[PDB]
């Protein structure tokens, strides 16, 4: 179902908040984003690792030179933080991702895994910044 | 769900500042902030 899949869908307005928040490679790794390829076609790629580009780009007000290790089943390449879509998982794109995972041999992550992963975001949101994170943020 | 919006005294950036937090701007380590204007009804007699 593409509706339960949208709970762990990372939108564009959420990344902006967590550009400099540590534990980054532990909250986003396991969710699915709606990345752009390009004409209105889209594919559901897998957040695998946290990579960094040599290309500094401005995202509205904010600027981030980082990358994203995404992969649609077997086709993997580099990605930037600008091309993600706020659009939710549609039906045609949900079945297309299902066919890219059945075609690659990757197991579909069990729904209980998605239910325990969507809550990591809400606890990371409400996180009290008592430790030495503001410092590393302004640095 | 209101996070109490402060303005940095030197960056002039908006900052979201809940309880039990250091009063620091998140742009640069400046230590003065100001509250933004009220949302209440402000009315004057031109008088």
């Amino acid at each position: 179902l593409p509706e339960e899949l949208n709970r762990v869908r990372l939108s564009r307005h959420k990344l902006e908040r967590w550009c400099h928040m540590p534990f980054f490679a532990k909250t986003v790794t396991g969710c699915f984003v709606r990345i752009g390829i390009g004409k209105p076609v889209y594919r559901v790629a897998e957040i695998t690792g946290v990579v960094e580009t040599a290309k500094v780009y401005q995202l509205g007000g904010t600027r981030t030179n980082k990358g994203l290790q995404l992969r649609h089943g077997n086709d993997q390449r580099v990605f930037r933080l600008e091309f993600v879509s706020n659009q939710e998982f549609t039906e045609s794109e949900f079945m297309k991702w299902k066919e890219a995972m059945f075609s690659a041999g990757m197991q579909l992550p069990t729904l209980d895994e998605i239910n325990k992963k969507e809550l990591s975001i809400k606890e990371a949101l409400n996180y009290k910044f008592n430790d030495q994170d503001i410092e590393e943020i302004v640095k | 769900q209101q996070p109490m919006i402060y303005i940095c005294g030197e960056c002039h950036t908006e900052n979201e500042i809940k309880s039990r937090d250091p009063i620091r701007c998140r742009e640069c380590g400046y230590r003065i902030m100001y509250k933004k204007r009220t949302k209440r009804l402000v009315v004057f007699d031109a008088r």
């Binding site: 939108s11 307005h13 959420k14 990345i35 752009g36 509205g60 879509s85 706020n86 659009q87 | 769900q1």
Partner: peptide, 17 residues
């Protein structure tokens, strides 16, 4: 104040560059 999109702000494509 979680996702105020209202669509969006013209999302740039990857195959456009």
């Amino acid at each position: 104040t979680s996702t105020y999109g209202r669509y969006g702000s013209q999302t740039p494509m990857y195959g456009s560059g």
